[PDB]
Model the fold of this input.
Amino acid sequence: NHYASKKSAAESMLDIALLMANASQLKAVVEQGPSFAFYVPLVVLISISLVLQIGVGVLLIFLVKYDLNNPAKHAKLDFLNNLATGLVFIIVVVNIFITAF
Amino acid sequence: NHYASKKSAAESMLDIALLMANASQLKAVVEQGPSFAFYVPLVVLISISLVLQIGVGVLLIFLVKYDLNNPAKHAKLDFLNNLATGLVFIIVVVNIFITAF
Amino acid sequence: NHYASKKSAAESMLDIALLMANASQLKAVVEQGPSFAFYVPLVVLISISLVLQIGVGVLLIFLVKYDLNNPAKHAKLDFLNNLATGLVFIIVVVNIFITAF
Done:
């Protein structure tokens, strides 16, 4: 059944860590907020997360879904980070472009 | 008999996870709602779900119908997600287009 | 004798699952109803069901007429659904066209 399973697929079982910050700030402003920066950046952040999503999801596929086994998992987390930080490049570049425009 | 069997086919035994969110928000507004966003987006969401439906349904065919066997099913769920997230691309692009228009 | 046998043929022993919803809503409004959507959509729904009927009936011919043998029948039901959902495409497209006109 698609219930919570293909919806899990829809979420990639969890969105990329960018959308974690996105959703936290999203709730914080859904309270109320006049922030010019966080008026409508929700659309952009996921749109940027697109190209990253393939790599991050596949790199989490073979990686453990718990990630609470050990802090030593940071190395495998860092093995993923070898290009996840190359994506963080794009993330911060998107931050620069958002600030500029 | 078509009863709950070809109707199951009509629903694909469950609609794509997009329509899960669609129907939840649908009930929430059927209570009552003036939301400009959720006045009549029901038509669009299924229409978008069309092209995705073939892939998602066939990818759920050989996949288990329970999906409550293990959280480890996320990997096979993620094996489906390899292109299900490519469809999530289209989903969020549709969100962008809906917001723009 | 044609009695309940060629009448069974006339009904295809049961109409396609579209007409199940059609007849349920039909009774619900035969009670009474001012619904602009469900004033006279009975004609269209069967007319749309035409092209689907050949495939669905033949796909139910070799399939069991009980369909209460197992929930596992969903897979064979889903084997039928491989193109039954391709027909659900047409079904929802017809819904879109009905809403537009």
Observations:
- The CA atoms of residues 78 and 85 of chain C lie 9 Å apart.
- The first helix of chain C runs from residue 6 to 10.
- Chain C touches chain B at residues 13-21, 56, 60, 65-67, 71, 73-75, 77-82, 84-86, 88-89, 91-93, 95-96, 99 (CB under 8 Å).
- Helices of chain C lie at 6-10, 17-31, 42-61, 73-100.
